[model samples]
Target: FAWEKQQRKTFTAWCNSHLRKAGTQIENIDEDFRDGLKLMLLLEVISGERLPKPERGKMRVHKINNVNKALDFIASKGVKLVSIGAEEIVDGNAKMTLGMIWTIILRFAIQDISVEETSAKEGLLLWCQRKTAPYKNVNVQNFHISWKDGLAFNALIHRHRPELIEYDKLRKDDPVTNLNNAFEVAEKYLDIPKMLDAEDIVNTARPDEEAIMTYVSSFYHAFSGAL
Candidate 1:
């Protein structure tokens, strides 16, 4: 079966090459471009098997007018799909993956109308609530560690003389340091669930559970100071 598939693919490639040759001289047919095309084709073939057909082309509309209409519709129907729970522990720790963190940040970034909009802050807070609540009864130490990690990151961004005032600028210089500083500052304000007592509000406001996951998840990509 595999041989048959390979043969069919090879034949298709040959046909495509012939078609291209018969056409007006292919312009800008660089090998690097062809390699990229091949990669995209392979990705499409692989992803086709993993994602449902209907979801492959789905777009998350974020127009302000559309958002209000959608929210109104949901409210009218009394529908709520939001779920705030700590993600399941995959490898032992109740930490999150980088991809997950990026998704949450990207979602809020997409919906935010302006840099100063309150929605982004609200989104982070909500995320923290959801993520931390799940670990309330699981492993207290892990929960605290997660919470502290989140708080530190937030503090680094919001505290006096914020450590990471500009994410793009910081990212360019050193993503690892930027991420580490965030985690360190957050931990200083929020105690690791069971590792230490919670800090006073004057020090660091309690973080939303999801925000903790977001900060911890970045550790996977920025591992310069991983311990």
Candidate 2:
């Protein structure tokens, strides 16, 4: 899609920006280039594609250590997730998966966006543009962290996965390479309802209603900015 292409172009520029870090007097990250950091992280999350450094496509050094510092900073500011009560847990299988529960999550969390990632992505891009600033001597060891940054980072996660848009819509995507995947079937059926019921049983295993509510609101808070 054009959206992906545009994002890729932006990302390519960001990659080049990383190269800008080289041949600098202090090896510092320029503020304009730092604007791409969250986008880089978001792209990795969305596409599941890890990017190496622009030079030699290998990570020799990075100013921010995403895995550790970002999360810790977010948590320190009391920005981490906490379950409301008991929450449902399940995994996907080829036979069937949970859409009924997804309905609940999207109704409240991603309710406004109608299951597309477009709005949220735009929101993040703007936020990144506004939030970025230059650093004098940035390093994982001597970095400054803040709550606003944490909140924005979480925003990035939800922006990519706006909503598995509630099970109400076509939650599952068909394979393009398959003969029967895209075409409509004449009463092709699986006991999808039964599968949902069975999955419900699994959801009730722990049965903490408060925890479930926590999940809903927390997820909504986590992702609603894009909406």
Candidate 3:
């Protein structure tokens, strides 16, 4: 087990080196700034990671009544129901990863101020844990594959086209070659938002246009260097 852990450590180190070559500059950044950056990056990667292929063209259907109920309950407690969608629910057991539960919770926590900052953060953390508790027994390694693949892809693109953008040298320290290797193992998927909207059965729910557009534009500029 120790050897296995060591191998993972080594692999991560090697992989990060290549990411630097691609010009990703998150390393050593303050945690607060890094959290925002991570969210943006996760959104981009999740958008690209493919969903599990529907077997025999069969679509999976989820009951939205429960989701609506949950939203109502949260709203009843004075939580601003900024945006509640099945797509926003991170399936901890899913084979592919887009964003983490904590990240999603943090986004909501920061959106409300009536609740004390500490209370909001704590409540959101608890909410995320409760949502994800069902899949607590799932294999950690399997869930991680999606995240690794997404990050690897992001790193490779940066490494191969570092000249496309400008970033601090310290932050751009990942090895492009290793990141490319990581991409080889990632899941192939279309953008997450498009997939969510395209599915006939998955009802599309979104936040206010201003909030949604603001979130979208921030990441658009980050990745494409265009607003």
Candidate 4:
């Protein structure tokens, strides 16, 4: 399904954004994560802790060992992994691989976002609601439909970089232009990469929630002055 494809694309962009700091990158999530070296490195990068160095060999057992170590580290963080193991990752199973990446994104990228006493998901939503509170038309409750109109993104940009977006000038019904404007401006001016396509959200009845949350975390990081 194109949803999985879109997820892979967004997950890859998100991974590479952080992986760039570790001096490596992943082009194919399933293939690249097979050996587990990049996976270990990615975990280390995200958690900012040292994981057992990935087993250095080309054998199946080595791959399993390395991937297992990474999985264990994730488990140590109190993350729940179901039916995912080193074998599945070593097998390069697309669905499981995507699941693994998504788990990492939620635990590291989305979970750590702190705007108040709220949980990560709620805190993020609250941050959006509070920032766009001044704009009478924008109301952000969920990551999917809440962002379909694109005003939330622009309102966020306008909140921090008033010079970047004229919030009032944007029309409510033109979803394409609004989405493109915010995505492009965030990528160029705010140092937030465009991990999603504007048309993808515009055409879909409900945009992928995980994808939107992942992208918005980048905005949170950018606006919050955190590196």
Best candidate, lDDT-wise? 4
lDDT, model 4 = 0.88
Instruction: Report the lDDT tens digits of candidate 1 across residue range 34-67.
Output: 2122222222332232211221221332222222
> Is candidate 1 or 4 superior in lDDT?
4
TM-score against native, each model? 0.20, 0.19, 0.18, 0.94
- lDDT tens digits, residues 90-111, model 3? 2222211112222333333233
lDDT of 2 by residue, 1-227 (tens): 33232222322332333233332211211232232344234334423445443222213233233223323333343443333111111111211112222222233233333333443323333333333222211111111122111222222222344342111222112112111211111012211111011122122323222222222233334334553
Provide C-alpha RMSD values for all models, in order: 21.7, 21.2, 21.1, 1.7
Q: Would you list the C-alpha lDDT of every candidate in the order shown?
A: 0.30, 0.26, 0.28, 0.88
Output candidate 2 Cα RMSD. Answer: 21.2
**Poorly placed runs, candidate 4 (over 4 Å):** none
lDDT of 3 at 117: 42
Worst 10 residues of 4 by lDDT: 218-227
lDDT of 4 by residue, 1-227 (tens): 66886798899999998899899899987799899999999999888899986778899999999999999999999998988978888988999999889899989988878877886888989999988898857988899999999899999989888999988889989989999999899889987777888888988898899889999988988888732
Q: After superposition, how far is residue 117 of candidate 2 from its true place, in Å?
A: 35
Off by more than 4 A, model 1: 1-80, 83-140, 143-202, 223-227
lDDT score, candidate 4, position 33: 88
